[PDB]
Motif scaffolding. Structure first.
Motif, short mmCIF file in Angstrom:
data_model
loop_
_atom_site.label_atom_id
_atom_site.label_comp_id
_atom_site.label_asym_id
_atom_site.label_seq_id
_atom_site.Cartn_x
_atom_site.Cartn_y
_atom_site.Cartn_z
N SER A 186 35.59 56.24 47.38
CA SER A 186 35.86 55.01 48.14
C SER A 186 35.88 53.76 47.25
O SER A 186 35.36 53.78 46.12
N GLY A 187 36.49 52.69 47.75
CA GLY A 187 36.57 51.43 47.01
C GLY A 187 37.86 50.66 47.24
O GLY A 187 38.91 51.25 47.54
N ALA A 188 37.78 49.34 47.10
CA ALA A 188 38.91 48.45 47.33
C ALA A 188 38.96 47.26 46.34
O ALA A 188 37.97 46.99 45.63
N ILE A 189 40.11 46.55 46.30
CA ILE A 189 40.30 45.31 45.54
C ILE A 189 40.37 44.17 46.58
O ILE A 189 41.08 44.28 47.58
N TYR A 190 39.65 43.07 46.33
CA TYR A 190 39.64 41.91 47.22
C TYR A 190 40.19 40.71 46.45
O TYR A 190 39.56 40.27 45.50
N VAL A 191 41.41 40.28 46.77
CA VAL A 191 42.07 39.18 46.06
C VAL A 191 42.66 38.22 47.08
O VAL A 191 43.51 38.60 47.88
N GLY A 192 42.16 36.97 47.11
CA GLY A 192 42.60 36.01 48.10
C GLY A 192 42.31 36.51 49.51
O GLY A 192 41.22 37.04 49.75
N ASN A 193 43.31 36.49 50.39
CA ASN A 193 43.11 37.00 51.75
C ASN A 193 43.61 38.45 51.93
O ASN A 193 43.96 38.87 53.04
N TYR A 194 43.54 39.23 50.84
CA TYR A 194 43.98 40.62 50.83
C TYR A 194 42.90 41.62 50.46
O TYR A 194 42.00 41.33 49.67
N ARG A 195 43.04 42.83 51.01
CA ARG A 195 42.20 43.97 50.70
C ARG A 195 43.16 45.12 50.35
O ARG A 195 43.97 45.54 51.16
N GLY A 253 38.68 36.60 48.72
CA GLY A 253 38.52 37.52 47.60
C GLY A 253 38.62 36.87 46.23
O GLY A 253 39.43 35.95 46.02
N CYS A 254 37.85 37.36 45.27
CA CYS A 254 37.80 36.72 43.96
C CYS A 254 38.20 37.60 42.79
O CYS A 254 37.98 37.19 41.64
N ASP A 255 38.81 38.78 43.04
CA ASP A 255 39.24 39.63 41.93
C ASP A 255 40.46 39.05 41.30
O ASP A 255 41.35 38.54 41.98
N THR A 256 40.51 39.15 40.02
CA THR A 256 41.63 38.69 39.23
C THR A 256 42.49 39.91 38.98
O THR A 256 41.96 40.96 38.62
N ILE A 257 43.79 39.81 39.27
CA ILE A 257 44.69 40.91 38.98
C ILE A 257 45.29 40.63 37.62
O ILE A 257 45.67 39.48 37.32
N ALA A 258 45.33 41.67 36.78
CA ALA A 258 45.93 41.60 35.45
C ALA A 258 47.45 41.56 35.58
O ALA A 258 48.00 42.27 36.40
N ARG A 259 48.12 40.77 34.74
CA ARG A 259 49.59 40.67 34.68
C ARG A 259 49.90 40.95 33.20
O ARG A 259 49.84 40.03 32.38
N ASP A 290 52.23 44.95 39.28
CA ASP A 290 53.56 44.45 39.65
C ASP A 290 53.56 43.66 40.98
O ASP A 290 54.57 42.99 41.33
N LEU A 291 52.50 43.80 41.78
CA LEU A 291 52.45 43.15 43.11
C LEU A 291 52.12 41.69 42.94
O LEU A 291 50.97 41.27 43.12
N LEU A 292 53.12 40.91 42.51
CA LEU A 292 52.92 39.50 42.16
C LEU A 292 52.47 38.66 43.34
O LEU A 292 51.69 37.72 43.16
N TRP A 293 52.88 39.04 44.57
CA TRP A 293 52.54 38.36 45.81
C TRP A 293 51.04 38.40 46.15
O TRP A 293 50.60 37.61 46.99
N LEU A 294 50.25 39.28 45.49
CA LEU A 294 48.82 39.35 45.75
C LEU A 294 48.11 38.03 45.46
O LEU A 294 47.06 37.78 46.04
N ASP A 295 48.66 37.19 44.56
CA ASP A 295 48.10 35.91 44.16
C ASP A 295 48.40 34.74 45.06
O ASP A 295 47.61 33.81 45.12
N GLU A 296 49.59 34.72 45.67
CA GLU A 296 49.98 33.62 46.54
C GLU A 296 50.04 34.12 47.99
O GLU A 296 50.57 33.42 48.86
#
Ligand SMILES: NC(=O)[C@H]1CCCN(C(=O)Cc2cccc3occc23)C1
Ligand SMILES: [Zn+2]
Length: 139
Positions: free
Chosen positions: A1-10, A43-49, A133-139
Protein backbone atom coordinates in the motif's frame (compact mmCIF):
# COMPACT_ATOMS: atom_id res chain seq x y z
CA UNK A 1 0.00 0.00 0.00
CA UNK A 2 0.94 3.69 -0.43
CA UNK A 3 0.22 6.90 -2.32
CA UNK A 4 1.72 10.25 -3.56
CA UNK A 5 0.08 13.48 -2.27
CA UNK A 6 0.81 16.52 -4.48
CA UNK A 7 -1.35 19.65 -4.33
CA UNK A 8 -5.01 18.59 -4.43
CA UNK A 9 -4.15 15.13 -5.86
CA UNK A 10 -3.69 11.61 -4.53
CA UNK A 11 -1.84 9.16 -6.84
CA UNK A 12 -2.31 5.43 -6.10
CA UNK A 13 -1.99 2.06 -7.92
CA UNK A 14 -5.24 1.74 -9.91
CA UNK A 15 -5.65 -1.91 -8.69
CA UNK A 16 -5.66 -0.69 -5.05
CA UNK A 17 -7.95 2.38 -5.51
CA UNK A 18 -10.80 2.74 -2.94
CA UNK A 19 -14.54 3.65 -3.33
CA UNK A 20 -13.57 7.22 -2.31
CA UNK A 21 -10.81 7.44 -5.01
CA UNK A 22 -13.33 6.38 -7.71
CA UNK A 23 -16.03 8.83 -6.38
CA UNK A 24 -13.46 11.69 -6.63
CA UNK A 25 -11.75 10.47 -9.85
CA UNK A 26 -9.53 12.95 -11.81
CA UNK A 27 -7.86 10.48 -14.27
CA UNK A 28 -7.11 6.76 -14.52
CA UNK A 29 -5.16 4.54 -16.89
CA UNK A 30 -5.36 0.67 -16.70
CA UNK A 31 -2.37 0.39 -19.07
CA UNK A 32 -0.23 2.30 -16.49
CA UNK A 33 -1.86 0.84 -13.31
CA UNK A 34 -2.43 4.51 -12.11
CA UNK A 35 -5.41 6.39 -10.74
CA UNK A 36 -5.44 9.99 -9.44
CA UNK A 37 -8.20 11.30 -7.19
CA UNK A 38 -8.93 14.73 -5.68
CA UNK A 39 -8.31 15.62 -2.03
CA UNK A 40 -9.68 18.26 0.38
CA UNK A 41 -6.24 18.56 2.14
CA UNK A 42 -3.07 20.02 0.53
CA UNK A 43 -0.22 17.69 -0.58
CA UNK A 44 3.47 18.54 -0.29
CA UNK A 45 5.32 15.90 -2.35
CA UNK A 46 7.62 17.21 -4.97
CA UNK A 47 7.47 15.38 -8.28
CA UNK A 48 10.79 14.97 -10.09
CA UNK A 49 11.00 16.35 -13.68
CA UNK A 50 14.17 14.52 -14.92
CA UNK A 51 15.61 11.45 -16.73
CA UNK A 52 17.37 9.95 -13.58
CA UNK A 53 18.03 6.22 -13.73
CA UNK A 54 19.19 5.89 -10.01
CA UNK A 55 17.20 6.45 -6.85
CA UNK A 56 15.92 4.96 -3.57
CA UNK A 57 12.62 3.04 -2.99
CA UNK A 58 10.72 1.97 0.12
CA UNK A 59 10.17 -1.78 0.46
CA UNK A 60 7.37 -2.43 3.01
CA UNK A 61 8.02 -6.24 3.05
CA UNK A 62 11.50 -5.48 4.51
CA UNK A 63 10.70 -2.19 6.40
CA UNK A 64 13.78 -0.77 4.57
CA UNK A 65 14.77 1.69 1.81
CA UNK A 66 17.03 0.36 -1.00
CA UNK A 67 19.21 2.19 -3.57
CA UNK A 68 18.50 1.03 -7.22
CA UNK A 69 19.42 1.62 -10.87
CA UNK A 70 16.25 1.48 -12.95
CA UNK A 71 15.37 1.31 -16.61
CA UNK A 72 13.69 4.10 -18.72
CA UNK A 73 9.81 4.01 -18.78
CA UNK A 74 8.63 1.48 -21.36
CA UNK A 75 6.02 -1.15 -22.34
CA UNK A 76 6.69 -4.31 -20.34
CA UNK A 77 4.65 -7.55 -20.47
CA UNK A 78 2.92 -8.33 -17.13
CA UNK A 79 1.38 -11.76 -16.44
CA UNK A 80 -2.37 -12.11 -15.71
CA UNK A 81 -3.61 -11.27 -12.19
CA UNK A 82 -6.88 -10.95 -10.23
CA UNK A 83 -6.91 -7.28 -11.37
CA UNK A 84 -5.85 -7.49 -15.05
CA UNK A 85 -5.47 -10.00 -17.91
CA UNK A 86 -1.95 -10.62 -19.44
CA UNK A 87 -0.91 -7.31 -21.13
CA UNK A 88 1.84 -4.73 -21.78
CA UNK A 89 1.98 -2.15 -18.95
CA UNK A 90 3.21 1.20 -20.27
CA UNK A 91 5.42 3.79 -18.48
CA UNK A 92 7.04 0.99 -16.38
CA UNK A 93 10.65 1.00 -15.05
CA UNK A 94 12.44 -2.17 -13.74
CA UNK A 95 15.24 -2.54 -11.16
CA UNK A 96 16.97 -5.44 -9.47
CA UNK A 97 15.62 -5.50 -5.96
CA UNK A 98 13.31 -7.25 -3.56
CA UNK A 99 9.52 -6.86 -3.91
CA UNK A 100 6.30 -8.75 -2.82
CA UNK A 101 2.66 -7.93 -3.85
CA UNK A 102 2.00 -5.82 -0.71
CA UNK A 103 4.95 -3.60 -1.72
CA UNK A 104 2.86 -1.77 -4.36
CA UNK A 105 2.54 1.94 -3.57
CA UNK A 106 6.06 2.28 -2.12
CA UNK A 107 7.69 5.48 -3.44
CA UNK A 108 10.77 5.62 -5.64
CA UNK A 109 12.67 8.97 -5.21
CA UNK A 110 15.81 10.50 -6.78
CA UNK A 111 17.57 13.79 -5.64
CA UNK A 112 14.86 15.75 -7.57
CA UNK A 113 11.80 14.28 -5.83
CA UNK A 114 9.17 11.57 -6.35
CA UNK A 115 9.80 9.42 -9.48
CA UNK A 116 7.02 6.82 -9.21
CA UNK A 117 5.49 4.02 -7.16
CA UNK A 118 6.00 0.22 -6.91
CA UNK A 119 3.52 -1.49 -9.27
CA UNK A 120 4.96 -4.98 -10.26
CA UNK A 121 7.75 -7.41 -9.22
CA UNK A 122 9.00 -10.96 -8.96
CA UNK A 123 12.22 -12.97 -9.41
CA UNK A 124 14.53 -10.38 -7.82
CA UNK A 125 13.03 -7.56 -9.93
CA UNK A 126 10.83 -4.60 -8.92
CA UNK A 127 8.76 -2.50 -11.34
CA UNK A 128 7.80 1.17 -10.78
CA UNK A 129 4.98 3.07 -12.53
CA UNK A 130 6.57 6.36 -13.65
CA UNK A 131 4.83 9.68 -12.75
CA UNK A 132 7.44 12.24 -14.04
CA UNK A 133 5.58 12.88 -17.33
CA UNK A 134 2.30 13.91 -15.59
CA UNK A 135 3.09 17.62 -15.74
CA UNK A 136 -0.49 18.56 -14.70
CA UNK A 137 0.13 17.15 -11.18
CA UNK A 138 1.74 20.54 -10.28
CA UNK A 139 -0.94 22.94 -11.51
N1 LIG B 1 0.63 -3.79 -12.18
C1 LIG B 1 0.10 -5.00 -12.18
O1 LIG B 1 -0.51 -5.47 -13.15
C2 LIG B 1 0.24 -5.78 -10.88
C3 LIG B 1 -1.14 -6.07 -10.25
C4 LIG B 1 -1.03 -6.94 -9.00
C5 LIG B 1 -0.21 -8.19 -9.26
N2 LIG B 1 1.08 -7.85 -9.89
C6 LIG B 1 2.30 -8.23 -9.44
O2 LIG B 1 3.32 -7.94 -10.03
C7 LIG B 1 2.33 -9.10 -8.19
C8 LIG B 1 3.67 -9.04 -7.49
C9 LIG B 1 4.38 -10.21 -7.23
C10 LIG B 1 5.63 -10.19 -6.64
C11 LIG B 1 6.21 -8.99 -6.27
C12 LIG B 1 5.49 -7.83 -6.50
O3 LIG B 1 5.88 -6.56 -6.16
C13 LIG B 1 4.84 -5.74 -6.55
C14 LIG B 1 3.85 -6.42 -7.12
C15 LIG B 1 4.24 -7.80 -7.10
C16 LIG B 1 0.95 -7.10 -11.14
ZN1 LIG C 1 15.93 12.88 -10.89
Amino acid sequence: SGAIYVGNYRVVNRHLATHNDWANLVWEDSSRDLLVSSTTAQGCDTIARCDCQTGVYYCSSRRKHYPVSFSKPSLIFVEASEYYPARYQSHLMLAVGHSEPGDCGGILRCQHGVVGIVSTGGNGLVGFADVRDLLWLDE
